[PDB]
Design a binder for this molecule. Structure first.
Ligand SMILES: [Mn+2]
Ligand SMILES: [Mn+2]
Ligand SMILES: [Mn+2]
Ligand SMILES: [Mn+2]
Lengths: 315, 313
């Protein structure tokens, strides 16, 4: 774990990227960004109502499972609160294991076309944003831990999205190809993260600070998604054929990994609340259509695929 | 290189730190931070004067050397401009190689006492600020590249501060000791960075945007300085004596590394402007008292050593 910087890179003369969309999003950053405009997030305390749920039952895939219904109310609430907590751990782990390393590759100029100052300005702005999103979800976890008086929480499984990337990188002897898989996993998370946030952002039944922080995050990520389409558009145009083919292969696998329900996490949480028959809830879930999927809306990645001209090459 | 996150750590019950000073700094962040209040930095177009210099001759260690005085004015300005760039590059490299990796250790709960929610809050705020500081300095470099029409800049030497830390780590086979060295190099940067920034922040003769962004950065780093004193006080009180000893040993070498003039960078700059006898200018500098030292003022780290009650350097 040697630390790295791009500060020593220097530069040569390059042609500018011409992107109307990137220029607009980059100029709009100070007026859009949650870090600039909503930084005093949680700081305010609360009109806090303890009976308002942490997590919407509407999206708990086992809400109506007889073994979940047969548990005591406090066991069910604890699971629902644990799932709110795990949702935030997921988002943070996504920033840190998926999005950030992808942005870091761009900032280090690893792909032809990535040295462009407008690309760099847009990406570094997104990096500032992810550090603030991390800050927000960290505060949301802490607040919840206090208000719900959760003294202890066990170590969690590694972000499922990342376990998948890890397994693919293991079969990639060459740095070039690993750089592509990293970039692609990042691009997919950035174009689709809106879908994970929208599950809570527009939910009027849960704690107001829960729909609030996902709303604020979602508004930044609408821009990150568009930025990422433009950047990948430019980078993909300049890639060699080996890079291009790898990119196309990696997309559908990155997509699944981003959208996947971590059933090991779900089992851990049910067991944490002493839910009898927890294996059976989770076995039934594996066997349910859509049961292994947390995120269902791939529209962001669809637009990106369209914008790269890859409709017919990608499943 | 595996990416890492602290997101999956969970928690056990622990007693707050009740640091009132940290509580204050954390609460003041939205009203203080440059990211919040000066995000629009370097978007605005102002009356730009090409004749105003980029860097203060007064801090150029070979300002009055014969072989540099002899060279053409356009060579002397390019070196001055390149040193302003090198300065920003030094600031970014320090954030990324030195400050952030130390903050990252705290966030990862690698030291007893670091799991504290207030400590975590103060640090994650500072980590947001460093991303924004990187952003400002990056834009400052690009503005200069545009206005000074700088077509090319060669790759630069690795941050001297970090070349020193790398070499210390090379002899540390145990993680616990590497962590301490990383922490200490970071705490030193954070407490002494004002001295680096002040070199430009209060100078009235250089380009206004140069003194301005350094000034904005300086304002945030005052708070990070105090944040770091609190945090390191709390971690140090909770360290075992093995850790405690390593920290004490690391302090002096971190200070020297933080302050060092990069002569291999100064030589690169002089060669780039094609200055005649660059090798000699730099040789003479290496033979001079204080020749290898850029930052003279260490009062920031002085204050931290005081607060850990370690006045015996
Ligand atoms: Mn984000
Ligand atoms: Mn994002
Ligand atoms: Mn800084
Ligand atoms: Mn700092």
């Amino acid at each position: 774990h040697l630390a790295t910087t791009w500060a020593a890179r220097g530069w040569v003369e390059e042609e500018g990227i011409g992107s109307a969309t990137l220029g607009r999003l980059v100029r709009a950053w100070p007026r859009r960004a949650a870090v600039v405009n909503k930084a005093d997030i949680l700081d305010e305390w609360a009109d806090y109502d303890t009976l308002v749920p942490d997590y919407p039952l509407e999206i708990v895939p086992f809400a109506e499972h007889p073994l979940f219904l047969a548990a005591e109310p406090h066991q069910r609430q604890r699971v629902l609160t644990g799932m709110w907590i795990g949702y935030n751990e997921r988002v943070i782990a996504t920033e840190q294991l998926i999005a950030e390393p992808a942005f870091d590759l761009v900032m280090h100029g690893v792909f032809p076309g990535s040295d462009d100052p407008l690309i760099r300005k847009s990406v570094q702005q997104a990096i500032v944003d992810e550090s603030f999103h991390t800050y927000m979800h960290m505060l949301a976890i802490d607040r919840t831990r206090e208000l719900r008086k959760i003294s202890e929480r066990p170590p969690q499984p590694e972000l499922v999205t990342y376990r998948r990337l890890r397994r693919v990188l293991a079969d990639m002897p060459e740095q070039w190809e690993r750089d592509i898989a990293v970039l692609v996993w990042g691009a997919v998370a950035e174009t689709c993260i809106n879908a994970l946030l929208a599950l809570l952002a527009r939910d009027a039944t849960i704690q107001p600070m829960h729909s609030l922080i996902t709303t604020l995050h979602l508004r930044d990520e609408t821009a990150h998604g568009s930025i990422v389409v433009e950047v990948v558009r430019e980078l993909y145009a300049r890639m060699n054929e080996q890079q291009r083919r790898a990119l196309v292969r990696c997309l559908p696998i990155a997509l699944e990994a981003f959208a996947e329900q971590d059933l090991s996490a779900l089992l851990l949480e049910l067991n944490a609340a002493g839910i009898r028959g927890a294996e059976e809830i989770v076995g039934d879930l594996r066997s349910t259509a859509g049961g292994t999927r947390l995120v269902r809306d791939f529209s962001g990645a669809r637009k990106m695929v369209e914008q790269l001209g890859l409709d017919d090459a990608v499943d």
